[PDB]
Copies of this chain bind each other. A is one copy, B any other.
């Protein structure tokens, strides 16, 4: 399908219960998702990322990211636009 766009050295991938795929776009300091059937990726409203290294999603839809370049972990609840720093 080839619809993710503009990735550089992507570092991790997670897939949630709805089949949405999440990718840490390491080389571009962002996290992108692609819903099942979608032809347009969405950049998640994480903020201040630096070379993110990995991602997980739990069964409640919360997305967790290791923000490698900032020595921290951040998370984003499903339907939230505002990250929590862990």
* A contacts, CB < 8 Å to B: 1-4, 7-17, 19, 21, 23-24, 26-27, 34, 53-59, 62, 64-69, 71-73, 84-86
Partner pick for A64 among B13, B54, B66, CB 8 A cutoff = B13
Contact sample, A vs B, 25 pairs, CB 8 Å cutoff: A1-B85, A1-B86, A2-B85, A3-B72, A4-B72, A4-B86, A7-B73, A9-B69, A10-B66, A10-B68, A10-B73, A11-B53, A11-B68, A12-B12, A12-B66, A13-B56, A15-B58, A15-B64, A16-B58, A21-B86, A23-B73, A24-B54, A24-B66, A26-B53, A27-B71
**Chain B residue at minimum C-beta to C-beta distance from A57:** B15
